[PDB]
Write a protein that binds this DNA or RNA. Structure first.
Ligand SMILES: [K+]
Ligand SMILES: [Mg+2]
Ligand SMILES: [Mg+2]
Ligand SMILES: [Mg+2]
Ligand SMILES: [Mg+2]
Ligand SMILES: [Mg+2]
Ligand SMILES: [Mg+2]
Lengths: 140, 151, 126
RNA sequence: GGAGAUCGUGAGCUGGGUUUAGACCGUCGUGAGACAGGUCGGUUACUAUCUACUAGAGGUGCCCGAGGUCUGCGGGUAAGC
RNA sequence: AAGAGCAUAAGUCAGCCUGACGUUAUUCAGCAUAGCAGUGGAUGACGAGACGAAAGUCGGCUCUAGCGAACUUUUGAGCC
RNA sequence: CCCUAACUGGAGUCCGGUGAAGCUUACAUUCUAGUGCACAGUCUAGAGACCUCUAGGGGGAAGUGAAGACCCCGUGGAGC
RNA sequence: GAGUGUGACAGUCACUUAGAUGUACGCCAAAAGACCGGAACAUGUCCCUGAGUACCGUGCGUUGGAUAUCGUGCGUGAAUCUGGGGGGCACCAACCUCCAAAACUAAAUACUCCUUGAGACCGAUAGCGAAAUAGUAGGGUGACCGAACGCUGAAAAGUACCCCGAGAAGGGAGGUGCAAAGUGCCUGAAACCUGAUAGUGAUGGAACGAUACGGCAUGAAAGGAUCUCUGGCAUGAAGGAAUCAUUCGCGAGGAUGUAGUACGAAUGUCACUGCCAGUGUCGUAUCUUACGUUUUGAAGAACGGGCCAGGGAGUGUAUCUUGGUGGCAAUGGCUAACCUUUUAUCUGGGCAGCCGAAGCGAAAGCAACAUGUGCGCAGCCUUUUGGCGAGGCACGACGUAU
RNA sequence: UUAUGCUAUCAGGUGGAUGGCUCGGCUCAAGAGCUUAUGAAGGACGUGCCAAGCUGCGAUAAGCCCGGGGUAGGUG
C-alpha cells in the first residue's frame, strides 16, 4: 500500500487496530474453510469439493492444431507468396503439414479453388472446399 | 526493469532524432553555435590526439560546451563524496563513430564528452537523465551504419 | 475543458495525444464542428479502451470512397476490397499495406483535420 | 434503642471465619479428583509527594514608630448528664 | 400439529385402473428487500399411459412438516 | 484486662558530616451538593481560603507495589 | 579531466591515472624426436559374456509415483545368444528397444576462510557484537550470554614568568593560536541545574490555552511609510432610528407621517500624526473538565506516559487479479536460459517455450456467423423532422454435451 | 528589596543531541582454494631498557640468516 499516505493515520486503513493480526483475520490460511465458513467463497472462486471424470495419459491423448477454411481461403495468397503454398493452373495447393495444422475445420467461406492436403477434415470443411471447386487430400 | 526491444528501439530512434532539433539541444543545457545535426567527414575518426579533437570542436563551434562541462564540474553535496561520487559531472558532446577507431581514445578525456560507436549506442547516452537533446557529432560512417540500426 | 478534462489530459504521456486533444478542441470551437470535440473526448478516455479496429470491420461497413476516422489503431486482420480513406491514430504494418494496395489512404487525425475542418461526411469507427 | 458513614474504619490493629498449596473423616466418582459437610495446620508489604486535620513557628497585609490594655466579627462546648 | 381449502365436492360408496410414470426447462422461496445448498413447489416441454361421451383430471394421498454435501462403496442402462 | 503510671537503654526530635530509592500527563489552598461510564481537588452552583515553614498520627488522593492467582472467555497450554 | 593526499575547492604540488616496462621460483606451452599399437571382411551341432544376483511374495519407510517411485527387513529365487531385461496392473501375442547384477572418467556446477573490484547500501543508539588494548570488560558451576567507548590544532605553537593556595590540585593575571579548539579537547541541542533580566506576586481557584480589550516591558536586522494615529468630505449593501404630530388600544404599547430619512459593513479621497505590526508578562470579559487508547458512552475513581534527546512499525520473492500510461498486433505478442560485455549497464542475437488464435465433452470424439434481421447512442447529413448509423443492445442461425 | 514562588528570554553549568568528517561495516561480482606426525589450527606461559593490554615472536623470543626490490632513515 501507499505507506506515505498513511503516515499519521495510526491504523493505516485497517479499521480497528485490533484488525490485521494474523490468519484469524482472514479466516485461516490459504483456501481453508471451504466446507465450513468459506463455502460460498469456495463456490464463487471455483474451489468447491468434489472430483469429476478421469484423465487419459498424455502419451496416448493428443490435441490437433486446427485452421478453418475461411482462414485458409482468405489468406491463401499470403501463403503462396510466403512459400507455404503454390498455384497450379489456378488452384491453390496448400499442405497443412508444413503449417503445423492437422485438422481443417469448416468455419468461414471458401471463394477459390483450394486443393488442401491435411491429416483430417471436418465434414463441413469437406463440403465447403469441394463446392468451391477444390478438393481435400488425406495424408497417408 | 524490462522494456520490450521494439519500444526500446523506438525510444532510441526518438532520442537520435532529438539530436537534430536545436530547440531540444539548447533547452537540454548545451552551448553550441553549429547547425544540427552535425555530420563530420570520416577523417575525424583517424585523429589520435586530444589537441586534434580540440581543433575540430573549435572549428565546429562545439568546444564551448566542453568548456562548460569542465568548469561546471562541481563537488556535490552529501554522502556521495565519501562513497566515491565526489563530483557532479556535466555532459557535453557525444561523438558517434562508424567502428572502433583512434578517435575513441583521442576524444575520451575531454570533459563531459562521450565517444562511442553505433553498436554501443543506447538511450542513456542520447538522453542523459532521461532528457533528450544531446549535442552529438556523427561521422559519415556512423550515418551510413545507422540505416536500419533500430528499425 | 474543466478539471475532469484536465485530469485526463495531464494523465497522458504521449505528446502527440496531448497536442491532438488540444487542437481538436480548438477546431471544434473554431470550425463549429462537434466531430472534433467528440474525437477529443474519445482520446481523453482511458487508453485501455482505445479503438483497435481490424480491416474486416471497415470492409464490412463501408462503401467506395468512404471516409473513416478511427480514434485508435487500425489492425490488419481481414481483407479490404474497396478503396477507403482512413484517418487513424496509428496503423499496423499489415493494415497500412492492405489499405494502400486496396487503393485507400492511410492518413492521420491531424491530416484529416487539415483536409476538411468541418468534418462533413466523416464517419467515426470504433 | 435501631440504623447510615465503600455492609465507616487492615498505607490503624487483629486474624477466629471464609478464600491457595498439606492432611484426616463422611459422601460422591472406575479413576484422577470433588463437596454449597465437618476437621487440624497455614507469610498481613511501603521511608507520606499532595490534600485534610491537630499543634508550634517565620513573614507579608492592615498600620505615624513602639508598647500596653481592651473590644468582639466570629469559632467551639455536654460541661454537664 | 396448527392454520387454511372443499358440498352436483377435495367428502362417502362403487366400476375400471397404477400418473405413487422415464427424460427435461424455467421461475420461485428456503435466503423479503439482497448474495448462499442439499432441497421443495409452481408452471411448462418430450415420451408413454389410466379413467371418461367429451371437456378434462391424474407427476400420489386437498395446501403448507416427515429430511442430508463432498469423498467412498454398492445397484441400474448404455457407453467411454 | 479494670486503667494505666513512672523509670531505663536504643531510635525519633534538634545540630555537624555523609547521602540513596519508590508513586509523577498537567495543574492543584480546599469543603458541600449535584452532574457525569450511576464512587469529582479540577465539571456545575454555592461555601471557604493571606503565604511560607516545622512537628505529628495516617482520614482522602477509589494512595503506592503486581498486564487479578477468584469468575468467564480462548476451536491457548501443561500435568494427571 | 579515475581518484586520494597536501594548512579551503588541484588534470599541471605529491602519490597516481592513461600507457608502457621488468621480474627469481614456478605454471601452461607450440615445432621436432622415443615408445605399447590400429581397422575391415569370410566361415560356425564351436567357446565366453558378472547369482543368493535379476525377478517374485510379504512388512515397513520414502516418493508425484497412482494395482504403475525408490530403498531395505524377512522369505523365495532364475536363464545363458535357440539367451536375458524394458515398453507406468498382471498375463498372452505382435512390434520397438536395450544387455544389468564389476570399474574409472575432464568440462560445464556449488560455496566463500581468503584476494581484488564495485556500490541509488550504513554513517558511530547506524553499519558486523566489535570504526576492534572486542567475543574484550562483565555475567553464568556449565552448556553459554555479552557491552560501552570515534574527532584539539595548519603546526604542540600542549600556556613561559608572576600572585594566591598545604599543594605536582585549583584559581587569578599573563601568554600561544585565524579561532581556546586547553588534552574523553570540532560543532555543542534539550531535559536538568545556577544566576540575571522583564512582567507579576503573601485576599487567592485549577487543562496552564483560544478570542477581544487594556497595563508594564520590548519593538537593531529581517515587517509597514497615504504605513500608524486622529479627523473631514463623497458613495454606501443588509439594516435603520431619535424626536415630535395624528389616531387606535383597558393597559404595557401599536399604526400612519417625519423616513427608507439621519445613520450604516465598506469603498474612495483629503488632511493630520509618529507610531504600528510583532514579541514577553500580567489583568478584565466569554468559552473550554488534557492527550492517545479501549469504549454505546472517557475529565474519569478505565488503560498509557516523570522529563528530554535519539532509535522505533506495510517490506521482498513467487503467483493471481485489476487500474493509469505505453510498444507491437492475427501476416499476433514477448522472449527464457544462453551467446555477444571490450568487466554486471549496454548493442545485436537467441522461436525453446508461454499467452492469444475454437469450442463443447468425464472420455472417445466431433467441431461453429469475415453479418440474416431489428432497435438505436455518438457523429455526419437534414427540409429540424427525419435519414445513414461504427461501437452498444435484442434476435436469428450455427458447434458441441446432455 | 514581596519572601517562598509563577511565566518568558538571556548568561553559565551539566549533558552529549545535531551537523560535518570517517583507516570500519554490509552486500554483490570476479578470482583463488586445502592443510597437519618434517607435529597443524588452537591454547598456556614467556619475550621489550623504562612495557600493563593488544599485536608479533619462542629461551636465537616486537626477533636471526641468505637472495632480490627499495634507499635514507628505522626502532608495531
Ligand atoms: K582536495
Ligand atoms: Mg484505612
Ligand atoms: Mg470460538
Ligand atoms: Mg589524474
Ligand atoms: Mg555499534
Ligand atoms: Mg552493528
Ligand atoms: Mg526520531
Amino acid at each position: 500500500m501507499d505507506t506515505k499516505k498513511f503516515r499519521g493515520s495510526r491504523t493505516c486503513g485497517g479499521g480497528t487496530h485490533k484488525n490485521r493480526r494474523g490468519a484469524g483475520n482472514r479466516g485461516g490460511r490459504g483456501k481453508a474453510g471451504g466446507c465450513k465458513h468459506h463455502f460460498v467463497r469456495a463456490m464463487m472462486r471455483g474451489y468447491s469439493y468434489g472430483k469429476h471424470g478421469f484423465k487419459r495419459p498424455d502419451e496416448v491423448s493428443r490435441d490437433v492444431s486446427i485452421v478453418n477454411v475461411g482462414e485458409l481461403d482468405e489468406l491463401a495468397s499470403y501463403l503462396v507468396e510466403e512459400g507455404l503454398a503454390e498455384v497450379k493452373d489456378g488452384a491453390y495447393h496448400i499442405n497443412l503439414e508444413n503449417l503445423g495444422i492437422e485438422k481443417v475445420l469448416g468455419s468461414g467461406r471458401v471463394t477459390k479453388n483450394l486443393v488442401v492436403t491435411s491429416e483430417e477434415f471436418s465434414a463441413s470443411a469437406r463440403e465447403k472446399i469441394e463446392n468451391a471447386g477444390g478438393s481435400c487430400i488425406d495424408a497417408e | 526493469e524490462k522494456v520490450n526491444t521494439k519500444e526500446r528501439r523506438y525510444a532510441i530512434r526518438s532520442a537520435i532524432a532529438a539530436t537534430t532539433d536545436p530547440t531540444l539541444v539548447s533547452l537540454r543545457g548545451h552551448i553550441f553555435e553549429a547547425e544540427l545535426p552535425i555530420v563530420a567527414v570520416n577523417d575525424l575518426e583517424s585523429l589520435e590526439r586530444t589537441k586534434q579533437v580540440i581543433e575540430f570542436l573549435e572549428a565546429a563551434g562545439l568546444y564551448e560546451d566542453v568548456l562548460r562541462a569542465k568548469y561546471g564540474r562541481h563537488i556535490r553535496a552529501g554522502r556521495g563524496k565519501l562513497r566515491g561520487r565526489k563530483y557532479k559531472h556535466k555532459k557535453s558532446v557525444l561523438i558517434v563513430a562508424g567502428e572502433n577507431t583512434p578517435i575513441l581514445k583521442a576524444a575520451r578525456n575531454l570533459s563531459g564528452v562521450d565517444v562511442v560507436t553505433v553498436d554501443s549506442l543506447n538511450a542513456e547516452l542520447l538522453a542523459p537523465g532521461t532528457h533528450a537533446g544531446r549535442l552529438t557529432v556523427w561521422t559519415e560512417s556512423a550515418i551510413g551504419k545507422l540505416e536500419g540500426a533500430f528499425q | 475543458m474543466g478539471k475532469k478534462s484536465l485530469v485526463k489530459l495531464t494523465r497522458k504521456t504521449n505528446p502527440r495525444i496531448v497536442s491532438l486533444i488540444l487542437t481538436l478542441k480548438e477546431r471544434a470551437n473554431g470550425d463549429s464542428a462537434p466531430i472534433w470535440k467528440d474525437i477529443a473526448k474519445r482520446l481523453e478516455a482511458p487508453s485501455r479502451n482505445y479503438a483497435a479496429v481490424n480491416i474486416s470491420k471497415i470492409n464490412r461497413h463501408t462503401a467506395e470512397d468512404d471516409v473513416l476516422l478511427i480514434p485508435g489503431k487500425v489492425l490488419g486482420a481481414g481483407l479490404l476490397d474497396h478503396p477507403v480513406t482512413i484517418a487513424a491514430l496509428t496503423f499496423s504494418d499489415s493494415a497500412f499495406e492492405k489499405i494502400t494496395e486496396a487503393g485507400g489512404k492511410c492518413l492521420s487525425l491531424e491530416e484529416i483535420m487539415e483536409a476538411n475542418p468541418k468534418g462533413s461526411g466523416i464517419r467515426i469507427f470504433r
